[PDB]
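Our collaborator T.R. sent over the components below with a one-line note: 'Predict the complex.' Nothing else. No constraints on interfaces, no templates requested, no preferences about which chain binds where. So this is a plain run: every listed entity goes in together, and whatever single assembly comes back becomes the starting point for the next discussion.
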Amino acid sequence: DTERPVVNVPSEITVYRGESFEYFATVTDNSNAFDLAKTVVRWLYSNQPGRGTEWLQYSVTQVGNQLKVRIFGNVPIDTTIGDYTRYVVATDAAGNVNATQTEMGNAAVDKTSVNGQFKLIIR
Amino acid sequence: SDTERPVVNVPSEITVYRGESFEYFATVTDNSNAFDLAKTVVRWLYSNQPGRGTEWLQYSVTQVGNQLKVRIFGNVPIDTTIGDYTRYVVATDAAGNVNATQTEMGNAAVDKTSVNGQFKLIIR
Ligand SMILES: CC(=O)N[C@H]1[C@@H](OC[C@H](N)C(=O)O)O[C@H](CO)[C@H](O)[C@@H]1O[C@@H]1O[C@H](CO)[C@H](O)[C@H](O[C@]2(C(=O)O)C[C@H](O)[C@@H](NC(C)=O)[C@H]([C@H](O)[C@H](O)CO)O2)[C@H]1O
Ligand SMILES: [Ca+2]
Ligand SMILES: [Ca+2]
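Returned assembly:
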């Protein structure tokens, strides 16, 4: 298997201070199998949710041949509002990833996006 | 001996504005580093055209080294419908392997999932 998985996520997810949120991303792959230990919702620098979005959580289930990545959390009242680039990073059973760290960095430089990239919009 | 598909790197969203010009770029790689540029296209699901209501969507293809470069550009009519459109970068390697087949594009469309090279044209 040399074909990488493909994530389907809303380009932008809008959340609000003092409120809970729940969104869903879907992942497919030619193999229909995934490495859940290597599937995460994270910011650019590490597998963490990120500064100012420390409360961003995720849960992974599989329904048929598709991953269902739940993107959820509760937004504290004292949150800094703004826009936060985050990523649904998914790995198939063979270790192919939807977006590499180099692809993510290149896209940030060029003000563009990679597969699985989305904006968490806090208002 | 080449069974590995070419891979398109395209922005998942291409945002454009009525009355303005736009320009984005995709790249294509392949283990063989060889392609059929004549079979590389930007198009909608059904056929080889820019798509209903988005016929002003243009593209050009070059090869720089081991990678295809696909310019995605144009001018947006002042009166074009506001909304989102699903389009595709479809590329072919020298061995005839495509990054996404018509069958795969159709199956993905009914499920509302995505294929490699699929992207959303956002008009505002
Ligand atoms: C701080 C910075 O400029 N970082 C760059 C740089 O990163 C590596 C770093 N220098 C290092 O020491 O290792 O280089 C990479 C490319 O390799 C990036 O360009 C990186 O910049 C960040 O890139 C990410 C990519 O997702 C975003 O574009 C970051 O900008 C934003 C965003 O998340 O979209 C802009 C936004 O206005 C900011 N929102 C608020 C509310 O502050 C957010 C946040 O600051 C961060 O997301 C952290 O929560 O960043 C961009 O800074
Ligand atoms: Ca795969
Ligand atoms: Ca190939």
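Summary for T.R.: The CA atoms of residues 42 and 48 of chain A lie 5 Å apart.
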